[PDB]
Each structure stands twice: as C-alpha cells, then as structure tokens.
Design an enzyme around this catalytic site. Structure first.
Site, PDB file in Angstrom:
ATOM      1  N   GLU A 268       0.774  -1.051   0.012  1.00 41.22           N
ATOM      2  CA  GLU A 268      -0.269  -0.195   0.045  1.00 41.22           C
ATOM      3  C   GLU A 268       0.878   0.808   0.006  1.00 41.22           C
ATOM      4  O   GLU A 268       0.765   2.102   1.242  1.00 41.22           O
ATOM      5  CB  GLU A 268      -1.039   0.058   1.164  1.00 41.22           C
ATOM      6  CG  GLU A 268      -0.089  -0.009   2.851  1.00 41.22           C
ATOM      7  CD  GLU A 268       0.003  -1.441   2.937  1.00 41.22           C
ATOM      8  OE1 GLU A 268       0.121  -2.415   2.080  1.00 41.22           O
ATOM      9  OE2 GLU A 268      -0.642  -1.186   4.363  1.00 41.22           O
ATOM     10  N   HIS A 292      -8.166  -4.019  -1.047  1.00 39.24           N
ATOM     11  CA  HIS A 292      -7.298  -4.263   0.438  1.00 39.24           C
ATOM     12  C   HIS A 292      -6.405  -2.737   0.163  1.00 39.24           C
ATOM     13  O   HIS A 292      -6.011  -2.226   0.924  1.00 39.24           O
ATOM     14  CB  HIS A 292      -6.723  -5.607   0.392  1.00 39.24           C
ATOM     15  CG  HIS A 292      -5.832  -5.858   1.516  1.00 39.24           C
ATOM     16  ND1 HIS A 292      -5.966  -5.947   3.029  1.00 39.24           N
ATOM     17  CD2 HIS A 292      -4.351  -5.609   1.977  1.00 39.24           C
ATOM     18  CE1 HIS A 292      -5.465  -5.952   3.480  1.00 39.24           C
ATOM     19  NE2 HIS A 292      -3.822  -5.865   3.123  1.00 39.24           N
ATOM     20  N   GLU A 293      -5.628  -3.121  -1.246  1.00 40.23           N
ATOM     21  CA  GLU A 293      -4.528  -1.885  -1.663  1.00 40.23           C
ATOM     22  C   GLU A 293      -5.036  -0.645  -0.527  1.00 40.23           C
ATOM     23  O   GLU A 293      -4.866   0.561   0.173  1.00 40.23           O
ATOM     24  CB  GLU A 293      -3.554  -1.757  -1.937  1.00 40.23           C
ATOM     25  CG  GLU A 293      -2.951  -3.289  -2.321  1.00 40.23           C
ATOM     26  CD  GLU A 293      -1.708  -3.620  -0.967  1.00 40.23           C
ATOM     27  OE1 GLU A 293      -1.191  -2.853  -0.206  1.00 40.23           O
ATOM     28  OE2 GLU A 293      -2.133  -5.111  -0.519  1.00 40.23           O
ATOM     29  N   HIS A 296      -5.443   0.184   3.101  1.00 43.31           N
ATOM     30  CA  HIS A 296      -4.818   0.784   3.269  1.00 43.31           C
ATOM     31  C   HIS A 296      -4.738   2.876   3.262  1.00 43.31           C
ATOM     32  O   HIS A 296      -4.193   2.609   3.764  1.00 43.31           O
ATOM     33  CB  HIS A 296      -3.411   0.012   3.053  1.00 43.31           C
ATOM     34  CG  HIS A 296      -3.126  -1.064   3.169  1.00 43.31           C
ATOM     35  ND1 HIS A 296      -3.285  -1.049   4.374  1.00 43.31           N
ATOM     36  CD2 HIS A 296      -3.044  -2.058   3.312  1.00 43.31           C
ATOM     37  CE1 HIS A 296      -2.488  -2.549   5.009  1.00 43.31           C
ATOM     38  NE2 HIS A 296      -3.125  -2.838   4.103  1.00 43.31           N
ATOM     39  N   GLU A 315      -3.858  -4.495   9.726  1.00 43.26           N
ATOM     40  CA  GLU A 315      -4.292  -5.398   8.320  1.00 43.26           C
ATOM     41  C   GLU A 315      -5.895  -6.030   8.592  1.00 43.26           C
ATOM     42  O   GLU A 315      -6.749  -6.082   7.831  1.00 43.26           O
ATOM     43  CB  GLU A 315      -3.065  -6.587   8.353  1.00 43.26           C
ATOM     44  CG  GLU A 315      -1.976  -6.069   7.689  1.00 43.26           C
ATOM     45  CD  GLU A 315      -2.320  -5.749   6.711  1.00 43.26           C
ATOM     46  OE1 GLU A 315      -3.139  -6.377   5.903  1.00 43.26           O
ATOM     47  OE2 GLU A 315      -0.895  -5.089   6.210  1.00 43.26           O
ATOM     48  N   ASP A 372       9.695 -10.502   9.007  1.00 42.92           N
ATOM     49  CA  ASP A 372       9.936 -11.379   8.193  1.00 42.92           C
ATOM     50  C   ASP A 372       9.280 -12.892   8.422  1.00 42.92           C
ATOM     51  O   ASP A 372       8.424 -13.235   7.534  1.00 42.92           O
ATOM     52  CB  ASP A 372      10.807 -11.544   7.757  1.00 42.92           C
ATOM     53  CG  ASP A 372      10.993  -9.647   6.316  1.00 42.92           C
ATOM     54  OD1 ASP A 372       9.863  -9.137   6.538  1.00 42.92           O
ATOM     55  OD2 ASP A 372      11.890  -9.390   6.310  1.00 42.92           O
ATOM     56  N   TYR A 380      -4.416 -11.334   9.637  1.00 39.13           N
ATOM     57  CA  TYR A 380      -5.370 -10.681   8.967  1.00 39.13           C
ATOM     58  C   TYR A 380      -6.647 -11.347   8.955  1.00 39.13           C
ATOM     59  O   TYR A 380      -7.656 -10.616   9.201  1.00 39.13           O
ATOM     60  CB  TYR A 380      -5.075 -10.872   7.532  1.00 39.13           C
ATOM     61  CG  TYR A 380      -4.129 -10.556   6.469  1.00 39.13           C
ATOM     62  CD1 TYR A 380      -2.268 -10.424   6.872  1.00 39.13           C
ATOM     63  CD2 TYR A 380      -4.345  -9.600   5.835  1.00 39.13           C
ATOM     64  CE1 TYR A 380      -0.867  -9.771   6.249  1.00 39.13           C
ATOM     65  CE2 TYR A 380      -3.393  -9.058   5.005  1.00 39.13           C
ATOM     66  CZ  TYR A 380      -1.903  -9.352   5.418  1.00 39.13           C
ATOM     67  OH  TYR A 380      -0.820  -8.591   4.891  1.00 39.13           O
TER      68      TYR A 380
HETATM   69  N1  LIG Z   1      -0.246 -13.661  14.593  1.00 38.43           N
HETATM   70  C1  LIG Z   1       0.495 -12.102  14.832  1.00 38.43           C
HETATM   71  N2  LIG Z   1       1.114 -12.307  13.702  1.00 38.43           N
HETATM   72  C2  LIG Z   1       1.226 -10.741  13.368  1.00 38.43           C
HETATM   73  C3  LIG Z   1       2.738  -9.921  13.040  1.00 38.43           C
HETATM   74  C4  LIG Z   1       3.283 -10.315  11.410  1.00 38.43           C
HETATM   75  C5  LIG Z   1       4.225 -10.400  10.587  1.00 38.43           C
HETATM   76  C6  LIG Z   1       4.936  -8.511  11.692  1.00 38.43           C
HETATM   77  C7  LIG Z   1       6.192  -7.928  10.489  1.00 38.43           C
HETATM   78  C8  LIG Z   1       6.178  -8.077   9.385  1.00 38.43           C
HETATM   79  C9  LIG Z   1       4.527  -7.340   8.789  1.00 38.43           C
HETATM   80  C10 LIG Z   1       4.288  -7.192   7.443  1.00 38.43           C
HETATM   81  C11 LIG Z   1       5.317  -7.544   5.781  1.00 38.43           C
HETATM   82  C12 LIG Z   1       6.616  -8.142   7.183  1.00 38.43           C
HETATM   83  C13 LIG Z   1       6.943  -8.259   8.281  1.00 38.43           C
HETATM   84  C14 LIG Z   1       4.419  -8.429  12.571  1.00 38.43           C
HETATM   85  C15 LIG Z   1       2.827  -8.819  13.431  1.00 38.43           C
HETATM   86  C16 LIG Z   1       0.633 -10.075  14.248  1.00 38.43           C
HETATM   87 SE1  LIG Z   1      -0.088 -10.822  15.332  1.00 38.43          SE
HETATM   88 ZN   LIG Z   2      -2.582  -4.998   3.599  1.00 40.11          ZN
END
Ligand SMILES: Nc1nc(-c2ccc(Cc3ccccc3)cc2)c[se]1
Ligand SMILES: [Zn+2]
Ligand SMILES: [Yb+3]
Ligand SMILES: [Yb+3]
Ligand SMILES: [Yb+3]
Length: 607
Positions: A268, A292-293, A296, A315, A372, A380
C-alpha cells in the site's frame, strides 16, 4: 518502545522530513546519495541521537555545513547496526536541525531487488524495486525505522535517461541530470506524513495508461494493456472506500505492476500501490487485492500501528474494509462468502503453526523475532474475525461502519496501539459497554489458537462448493465416472477456488480421484494463480508425479510468497520431488528477492 528499532525513540526526537537525493547505479547495484533528515528534539539539552541502518556505507554526516562525529554499533542480526550521531550544538525541546548523511547501499540490501535485463519483460533494460515493510527502510537509508514516527519527504533520483523512476509520492517533475547528460533526475513530493516503511522506489522501462480520473497503471509495455483491463474497477472501489473511510487525502491513486518476483500480493505505498503480476487472471477476479490496497489509504497509511506488535490493527481493519468494498460491488452474500473463506484460511494457519504457537496470537511480542519470519495470514484473518464478531455483537454492519469512520477520523496521522483502539471502541460504544464486557478480550487479543467464538456466516454461495468437495471426498472408485464438466457449470471462479480450498483441507485424496479431476475439469488449463496454486498443492500432496514439473514451474516463474513458499514446502515433503525442490531453490536463489530467498531457505532447511 519499538523493540524492532535501534534508533532514538519518538520520546527523544522525531524526524519531521526526509529530503533524499540519490543516484541509482545499476553497474554497482547501489543507491548513493544524501538523506537530509529534519529532526525535532522532544527533550532539553539533546546532544546525540541514534538512527537505524542495515548494510549501509556511511561516507560522512554534515550538520550546519560541517562534518560531525558518528559511530556504527555492532550489527544486531536482522535489526542491523545502530548509528549514533554527535550533534555540534545541544538542542532545546522542539528545536529542529537538518542532518545530511552521505551513504551508499549494499548490493545485498534486504529492501531492494536488482534485476538484469534477462529478468525483465522487455529484455533490454535492468529494473530495481524496493519493499520496506516491515523494517527494511534502514537497508536503503539511515532513519528512525519505526512506524511510531511519521515524516513528509521530497526526493530527487538520478537514473539512466532511458528509464523511469517512481516513488510513493506525487511526481514533481523531471530534468536532465546537470552532473551527467546520460541521466535524468525525477523529483517527488509526499506532503502527507507517513511512517518510513511506506517509502518506495522503482526504476525501470515503465509505461503508463490512465484507467480513471486519479489512476495511472504503470508496468513494462508488455503488461500495460492486460493491467489496464484487470484493474478497471479501481475508481469505483476508491469511491466506495471514500464513502466508508472519509476523504481520500493522498491526491493520486496509481498502480504499479511489478515483475513476478514481487514478494506480496500488494503493498500500500501511498500514491503508488505495488501489485503482483499474478493478479492478471484476465477476468478481474483477483481485484479484492486492489480493494485491500485501496483500504490501506485509511487503515494503515492514515491510522498506523505504533509498533509491529500491533500490526493486526493495520491488516484486520483493512480486510474488514476490503470485504465491505467487495460487498458493496457484488452483494452481502459475497461479503459473507469471502468472510467464511477467511475463517478457513485462519483454520489452516492455526493447524500449520499449532494451536499453542505464539504466531497464532492477535498481539505478538516481536522483541527477538525477525518480523519477516513472523509474517502470516493470522493478523489478517484473526483480526478480521474479531471485527466481524464485534459487528454482529454491536448491531450489524451499518453501526460498525460508523465506528470504523469515527476511528479513522480520531487517529488520522497518528500511530496507535491495541489499547488505544480498545479505549476508543469503548468510548464510541459507551451505550453498549455491557455487550463489550461480554467479549473475552484476553482470549481474542493474547491467547493462541482459534478465537473463542466463531461469527455467524451466510452459507448461500459456499453450499455448492462444500457439496462438490464432499462428493469427491466421499467418492469411491465406482463413483468416479459420475463426475463431469457439468459439475462446474454454475460455479464462479471464486466458487471453484473455494471448492479447491475445501478439498485441499482434506488432502491427500486418492491419486485416481485427482487424475479423474484433471480428466473431467481440465484444471491444468486454468491460469488464475489462486486456483492453479490450490490445484497444484492438491496434486503434489496427493503424490501425482505428473504435477511435479507444473509445481516447480509455478514456484520459480513467480515469487509471490503466498504461492512460492507452500509450493516449495509441498515439493520438499513429496519424496519423488524432494531433491528437485532443493536443487531448483539452489539454482534460482541468486535471482530471487532477498527476503523470499531467506524464507524459502528456512522452509526447506537449506542454508
Ligand atoms: N500472528 C501475528 N503476527 C503478527 C505480525 C506478523 C508480522 C509482522 C511483521 C511484518 C509485517 C508486514 C510485512 C512483513 C513483516 C508483524 C506482526 C501480528 Se499477530
Ligand atoms: Zn494489507
Ligand atoms: Yb536547556
Ligand atoms: Yb510541483
Ligand atoms: Yb477507557
């Protein structure tokens, strides 16, 4: 405090503005230039500050026209190296200075993919693109790499004159590079304050086509016509999103169609959404990604997560808006269909991670976790499921949409936590606090596994998909000749995808069932990336050796992690394809996106 950042926190100082002047050197695969940060002290007598960096070469740091002392700390793995800067004069509270840092990127920058001509559609010119989310901006430039800080930016980017630069900003002119007539400078302005993960750059042989009053599509020439048609609903989706969220504040809403190695469905980036070419199904069926985008532009880009622990705020609310846009266009039964599909994706994630896995929590602690590696569909879908549950609890979609618009207005241009969201929810719904106190907040926000309550879903569009899935699962050999191409005649592409998703949840099926499916439905002929992905997973998990070349080809000819990671993992788990999976990964690794390469390597246990 943001445990993913080594920089001075927003309580000490705040970047207000970045002025980036850089040159894209395709021979050295480096970005070289100056990042001028306008920094505001939040404390008395401030004499140093710390920035995030990752694999950056620092030439010098200049304040008030003189070079100043700086030091790089020891690298802290994926967080990079802290850069401490000694200010020439102590700042009082709210005083601003401009810090000009001369830097160069590493060719291995985790933010960047550099493509040779051979890796592009046109085969004549190289290509570069960035992806900063979550914490890769520090691998392009020194910054407070935390979404708790929002800045405006301006940029001037020198590139080979035959190429086009674009950024997450309004195009602000182009001129010959006065330092080099073989080069052109493209200028950009982002006047709305953004977290630095939304900074983006592409450089390539790009062309544009207008598809609405505020939307150009950008791609290599080979993809422009297909892209213009695929994303033709964009303006209609923007108008619906404005109705739900309030005014679109960003000016332009352009789309860029990346090369196939783009790791995500979309990103986004303000004024310039990045999308995967795997959306190009030919029938606009994957346009929910555009919804979705678009969404955002309110949830994430205006109201932002203060730290990556609270990413579900970005998300969850965005999937909630996305599904309302699709519901306004195609009906409420379609919104319920997509919502119930997302519950199924949540069931899959919880089954894959395990029901006690910390990455199944809605609020996570990423202190010593590579963001990552944590990335999944949980924020989501568990996020969406909480909002859909609250919508039903609090009197339906009209009422909950009033909350969503009020929430966006309240927290516009701010960075918030889950507690900020919950407090505002309680304030907005003051007359329904009795209902809100029925929610098991501790379970929803902080417990692993499936949520403690499942929302109510309309089944109307899902029934035919479950009925056909169940016919195949319960079929014996003497029932296979009862299946026919007519079974599909009343199913949309969405329903075909959901049939395959239902069936994949019970995989494997007998090999003779899978061969019969190909015989009567010809799923091998379908180019829709979502359908083909689930079909090839079903074939590989069902041990069909004929599918091995198709799955290897899909896993390597595109790089959207949603598809590439599970396809590699399925091919690695099948003894007949195991060695080919590992060998193919090793052969393609150097050509892959650096983050995709790292994660596929971890999935395959290949170092
Ligand atoms: N289960 C859960 N995972 C999360 C969660 C997962 C990944 C990120 C980092 C990220 C975001 C966007 C692109 C790359 C890495 C942050 C929070 C929240 Se609740
Ligand atoms: Zn998104
Ligand atoms: Yb002072
Ligand atoms: Yb201008
Ligand atoms: Yb409160």
């Amino acid at each position: 405090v943001d445990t993913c950042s080594l920089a001075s926190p927003a309580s000490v100082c705040r970047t207000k503005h970045l002025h980036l002047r850089c040159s894209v050197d395709f021979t050295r695969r480096t970005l070289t230039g100056t990042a001028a940060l306008t920094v505001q002290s939040q404390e008395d007598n401030l004499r140093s500050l710390v920035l995030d960096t990752k694999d950056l070469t620092i030439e010098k740091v200049v304040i008030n026209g003189q070079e100043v002392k700086y030091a790089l700390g020891e690298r802290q793995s994926y967080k990079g190296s802290p850069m401490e800067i000694s200010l020439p004069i102590a700042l009082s509270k709210n005083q601003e200075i401009v810090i000009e840092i001369s830097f160069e990127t590493s060719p291995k920058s985790s933010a960047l993919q550099w493509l040779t001509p051979e890796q592009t559609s046109g085969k004549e010119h190289p290509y570069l693109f960035s992806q900063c989310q979550a914490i890769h901006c520090r691998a392009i430039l020194p910054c407070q790499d935390t979404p708790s800080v929002k800045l405006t930016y301006t940029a001037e980017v020198s590139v080979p004159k035959e190429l086009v630069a674009l950024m997450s900003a309004i195009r602000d002119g182009e001129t010959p590079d006065p330092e080099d007539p073989s080069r052109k400078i493209y200028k950009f302005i982002q006047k709305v304050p953004i977290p630095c993960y939304l900074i983006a750059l592409v450089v390539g042989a790009l062309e544009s086509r207008q598809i609405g009053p505020r939307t150009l599509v950008w791609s290599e020439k080979e993809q422009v016509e297909k892209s213009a048609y695929e994303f033709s609903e964009t303006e209609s989706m923007l108008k619906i999103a404005e109705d739900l969220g309030g005014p679109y504040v960003w000016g332009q809403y352009d789309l860029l169609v990346l090369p196939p190695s783009f790791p995500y469905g979309g990103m986004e980036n303000p004024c310039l959404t990045f999308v995967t070419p795997t959306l190009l199904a030919g029938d606009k069926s994957l346009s929910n990604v555009i919804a979705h985008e678009i969404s955002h532009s309110w949830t994430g880009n205006l109201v932002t997560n203060k730290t990556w622990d609270h990413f579900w705020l970005n998300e969850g609310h965005t999937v909630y808006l996305e599904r309302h846009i699709c519901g306004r266009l195609f009906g409420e039964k379609f919104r319920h269909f997509n919502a119930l599909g997302g519950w199924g994706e949540l069931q899959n994630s919880v089954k894959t991670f395990g029901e006690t896995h910390p990455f199944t929590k809605l609020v996570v602690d990423l202190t010593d976790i590579d963001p990552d590696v944590a990335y999944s569909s949980v924020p989501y879908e568990k996020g969406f499921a909480l909002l859909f549950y609250l919508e039903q609890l609090l009197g339906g979609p009209e009422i909950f949409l009033g909350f969503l618009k009020a929430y966006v207005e309240k927290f516009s241009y701010k960075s918030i936590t889950t507690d900020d969201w919950k407090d505002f929810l309680y304030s907005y719904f003051k007359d329904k606090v009795d209902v809100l106190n029925q929610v098991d907040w501790n379970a929803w926000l902080y417990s692993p596994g499936l949520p403690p309550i499942k929302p109510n879903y309309d089944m109307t569009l899902t029934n035919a998909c479950i009925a056909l899935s169940q016919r195949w699962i319960t079929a014996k050999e003497d029932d296979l000749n009862s299946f026919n191409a007519t079974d599909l005649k009343d199913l949309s592409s969405h329903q075909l995808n959901e049939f395959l998703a239902q069936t994949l949840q019970r995989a494997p099926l007998p090999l003779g069932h899978i061969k019969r499916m190909q015989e009567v439905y010809n799923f091998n002929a379908i180019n829709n990336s979502e359908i083909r992905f689930r079909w090839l997973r079903l074939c590989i998990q069902s041990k069909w050796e004929d599918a091995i070349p198709l799955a290897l080809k899909m896993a390597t000819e595109q790089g959207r992690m949603k598809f590439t990671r599970p396809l590699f993992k399925d091919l690695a788990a099948f003894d007949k394809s195991h060695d080919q999976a590992v060998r193919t990964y090793q052969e393609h690794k150097a050509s892959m996106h650096p983050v995709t390469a790292m994660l596929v390597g971890k999935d395959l246990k290949v170092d």
